[PDB]
């Protein structure tokens, strides 16, 4: 549900 | 004034910068909707929700608490070394203290489709866990904020947790000194306390914390009654609100303040 904002930016659900 | 640099981390209102209580000093858009969220710059230590606990997952699809349901990868609740795993290819975050490393941990899950909104966070000195907070708000007085045997190992993280905390935020309790107002080469008393009784310095760093800087009335900018001189042997909890500039030495009492550690002394 969330995007990790600092690189690399990865989609957890 | 030879007390300045070392009373700098007693500016609340400076090096803090929003409410202790109830922080929600900055406010962030989330897909065109306005949300108030915490912005301290120092950590809270011993802050925890009373509900009437608040670090169980929140209900997802109404029992749960106020931290972020389970993920894959989990990355809440989260270990000091799961963190430090995590980012071990980014140095400029894989050595961070525990306390700014689990902020900088829940400011990194973004929620929208590139927006400021940044999760709170609770760390866990027992277990060494970081809990990101999904839910940001602290009272609805329903729950209220508040300093307790049981949260003595938690501590209240916002989005703004600076990585030098341990050098301009207070911590331990000051044993042997009393706060004071620097003025003409000697360190007076503060002219007016107010005096709240209390029967051990926790509970005059609990009453402090009640009192101290609030968003929500039950943007303070930092300001109010976050300062206590608590006089161990007539058990007073005196409680201020203007910042101290200097220290007297009392063995009769303790300097604590709100966002200080409610047993730690130094």
């Known amino acids: ?10 989609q957890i659900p | 004034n030879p007390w300045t640099e070392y009373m700098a981390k007693y500016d609340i209102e400076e090096v803090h910068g929003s409410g202790i209580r109830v922080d929600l000093g900055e406010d962030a858009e989330v897909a065109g909707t306005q949300y108030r969220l915490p912005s301290g710059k120092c950590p809270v230590f011993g802050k925890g929700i009373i509900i009437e606990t608040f670090l169980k997952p929140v209900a997802t699809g109404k029992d749960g608490g106020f931290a972020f349901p389970p993920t894959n990868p989990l990355i809440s609740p989260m270990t000091l070394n799961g963190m430090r795993d995590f980012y071990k290819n980014n140095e400029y975050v894989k050595n961070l ?7 900088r941990h829940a400011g990194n899950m973004n929620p929208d489709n590139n927006s400021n909104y940044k999760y709170p966070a ?5 277990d060494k866990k970081c809990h990101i907070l999904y839910i940001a708000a602290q009272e609805n007085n329903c729950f209220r904020p508040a300093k307790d045997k049981l949260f003595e190992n938690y501590t209240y993280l916002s989005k703004n947790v600076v990585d030098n ?24 008393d503060i002219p007016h306390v107010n005096e709240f009784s209390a029967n051990d310095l926790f509970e005059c760093n609990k009453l402090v914390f009640e009192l101290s800087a609030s968003d929500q009335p039950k943007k303070s900018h930092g300001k109010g009654y976050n300062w206590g001189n608590y006089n161990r042997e007539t058990q007073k909890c005196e409680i201020f609100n203007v910042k101290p500039t200097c220290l007297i030495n009392n063995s009769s009492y303790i300097a604590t303040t709100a966002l200080s550690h409610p047993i730690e002394v130094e």
């Open chain 1, 1 to 10: 549900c969330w995007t990790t904002r600092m690189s690399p930016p990865m």
């Open chain 2, 165 to 188: 905390w341990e050098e301009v935020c207070p911590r331990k309790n000051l044993e042997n000194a009393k706060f004071g107002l620097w003025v003409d080469g000697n360190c007076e």
């Open chain 2, 122 to 126: 609770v760390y866990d000195y027992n």
């Open chain 2, 97 to 103: 203290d525990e306390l700014t490393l689990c902020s």
